[PDB]
Design a binder for this molecule. Structure first.
Ligand SMILES: Cc1cc2nc3c(=O)[nH]c(=O)nc-3n(C[C@H](O)[C@H](O)[C@H](O)COP(=O)(O)O)c2cc1C
Ligand code: FES
Length: 326
């Protein structure tokens, strides 16, 4: 049940700007690490402010355009945005980790892969959400495949990897900075510009991913045309408690405000199906017999959400005070 881990050394730390720190991680003896495909992340072990150990996802970064670029890597590269008001994990990555330190990680996992079907690729990055999309861009360039990146942030001063991405993509990089535009990214115009059949890869904050989801579902885009990678944690936000009644056996649990339905069930004892835990994979779907749902996933169709008979319990909640689940 414990997940396999690697003990890596911090081979380089680089302050890209005041908020974002690049870390290069190597095996102790420089041997090859598990390979990965564009979109993969690693989970890294952090110490929280009270000394509790926990795990944090960070996407793997590569700009090299050799076709073998990430098949047998000898390093993993990540970039961490410091959240001074977060839970302490990103703070640890900035303040409690030094060059030469060792760090336990879990082997790469990929919930956000590039699609090999027909069509080019349009990448939509919000802030530090650029990290797996940079690797995606590098891979499409390695393939000679059409790719465009929309990279949006509040200020250019705080957006990482602009010189690397400009060199990699040239005119196929479109940078949006709120501080220059005076307005947020125009997602409607972005979607209008996507070439017919091209697939969309959206990574970053919940508010951006939600705006893309609403519009691509309104447009009736095919379900495998749009791909989502949600960085925002915790997914259990402002949220309220609610009752869950398990219809098979009458048990009524109270889901607290800071806990997902899935985590509440996993805790109390059941064996739910799950994987990504952030609304992307679809695996945790449960039928809903009664109660209005506040849907927060990126996998159910507009029709499925409207019918009200299924939800992703890793991320979605009750609209009211009670849900009856099968
Ligand atoms: C799949 C996945 C990939 C992520 N990749 C990054 C990343 O590359 N850089 C980053 O700053 N945060 C990334 N995040 C968000 C972090 O895991 C984490 O939530 C963030 O650093 C805040 O944690 P904290 O509140 O403990 O500081 C990712 C989250 C997920 C689920
Ligand atoms: S576990 Fe992936 S959608 Fe819930």
């Amino acid at each position: 049940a414990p997940t396999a881990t690697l003990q890596l050394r911090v081979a380089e730390a680089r302050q890209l700007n005041p908020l974002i720190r690049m870390l290069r991680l190597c095996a102790e003896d420089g041997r090859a690490l598990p390979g990965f495909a564009a979109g993969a992340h690693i989970r890294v072990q952090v110490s929280l402010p009270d000394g509790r150990t926990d795990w944090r996802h960070y996407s793997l970064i590569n700009f090299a355009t050799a076709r073998n670029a990430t098949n047998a890597p000898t390093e993993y590269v990540i970039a961490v945005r410091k959240e001074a008001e977060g839970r302490g994990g990103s703070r640890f990555m900035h303040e409690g980790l030094n060059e030469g330190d060792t760090l336990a990680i879990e082997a790469p996992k990929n919930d956000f892969p590039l699609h090999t079907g027909p069509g080019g690729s349009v990448l939509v990055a919000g802030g530090i959400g650029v990290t797996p999309l940079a690797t995606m861009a590098a891979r499409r360039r390695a393939e000679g495949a059409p790719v465009r990146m929309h990279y949006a942030g509040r200020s250019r001063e705080l957006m990482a990897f602009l010189p690397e991405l400009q060199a990699l993509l040239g005119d196929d990089l479109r940078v949006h900075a709120d501080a220059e535009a005076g307005a947020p990214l125009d997602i409607d115009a972005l979607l209008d510009g996507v070439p017919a059949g091209d697939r969309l890869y959206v990574c970053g904050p919940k508010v951006m991913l939600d705006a893309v989801l609403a519009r691509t579902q309104a447009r009736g885009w095919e379900h495998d045309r749009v791909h989502f990678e949600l960085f925002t944690e915790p997914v259990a936000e402002g949220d309220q408690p609610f009752e869950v009644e398990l219809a098979q056996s009458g048990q009524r649990f109270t889901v607290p405000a800071g806990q997902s339905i899935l985590d509440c069930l996993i805790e109390h004892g059941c064996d739910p199906m799950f994987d990504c835990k952030r609304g992307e994979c679809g695996v945790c779907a449960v039928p809903v017999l009664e109660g209005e749902i506040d849907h927060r996933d990126y996998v159910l169709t507009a029709r499925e959400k409207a019918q009200g008979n299924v939800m992703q319990i890793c991320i979605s909640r009750a609209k009211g005070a009670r849900l009856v689940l099968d």
